[PDB]
């Protein structure tokens, strides 16, 4: 039921920069049930953030996240070459889970 939207559909940056990506949901998610994935062309997506602001094992400390009601933010600091590609945004509060339309970092 919850439909999520990502505003910066196309985004560009340079090495060493810092970028922000925003997700808006149709309903407030008080449990911070939002996950952030990264996908490079021709490869399977990789999970980076779960529970709004938690890191998986092995994910670089540069990535970070914040959650507040309907507004969720992913922050990437000291951007490197391997961090480009399509970033995806998912909710798992209400069945079924629903993904965002994705934001491309060039």
């Amino acid at each position: 039921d919850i439909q999520m939207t990502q505003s910066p559909s196309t985004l560009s940056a340079s090495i060493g920069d810092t970028v922000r990506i925003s997700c808006r949901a149709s309903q407030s998610i008080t449990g911070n049930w939002v996950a952030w994935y990264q996908q490079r062309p021709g490869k399977a997506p990789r999970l980076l953030i779960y529970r709004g602001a938690a890191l998986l094992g092995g994910v670089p400390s540069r990535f970070s996240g914040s959650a507040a009601g309907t507004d969720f933010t992913l922050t990437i600091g000291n951007l490197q070459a391997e961090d480009f590609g399509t970033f995806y945004c998912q909710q798992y509060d209400t069945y079924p889970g629903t993904f965002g339309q994705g934001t491309k970092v060039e």
């Binding site: 999970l47 529970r51 798992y92 509060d93 209400t94 629903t98 993904f99 339309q101």
Partner: protein, 130 residues
């Protein structure tokens, strides 16, 4: 570690049925891991297909009656495997299908919320063209 391998590309005609396998190296059992099947149309976003969790099979509303998901555990010669079957194909089903697995052992993990889940491990995905 955990590596998920799937079958190769498959090209079919409308009206037929297809099956995709997913072997999970590193998964001790599917009683503590949940299997999620996801779709990705070319140039679009991801779409949830179905779930095997605690040996219970579920599919979303858009796929009820057309998709059948099965799974068997560690046997001795092969790792645990999951299988996704599509009964009636159409021109809109051409996409990349992904097999994902998420741990469920800890009730406080934060990677799952009462059945609806995140996807920690991903397979290389298969391509189905109709």
């Amino acid at each position: 570690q955990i590596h998920l391998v799937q079958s190769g590309t498959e090209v079919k005609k409308p009206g037929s049925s297809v099956t995709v396998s997913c072997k999970a190296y590193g998964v001790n059992t599917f009683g503590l891991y949940a299997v999620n099947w996801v779709r990705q149309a070319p140039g679009q976003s991801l779409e949830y297909i179905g779930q095997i969790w605690r040996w219970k099979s579920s599919a979303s509303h858009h796929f009820r009656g057309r998709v059948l998901i099965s799974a068997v555990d560690l046997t001795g010669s092969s790792p645990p495997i999951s299988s996704l079957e599509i009964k009636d194909l159409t021109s809109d089903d051409t996409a990349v299908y992904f097999c994902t697995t998420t741990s469920t052992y800890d009730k406080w993990s934060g990677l799952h919320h009462d059945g609806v889940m995140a996807f920690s491990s991903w397979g290389q995905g298969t391509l189905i063209s109709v």
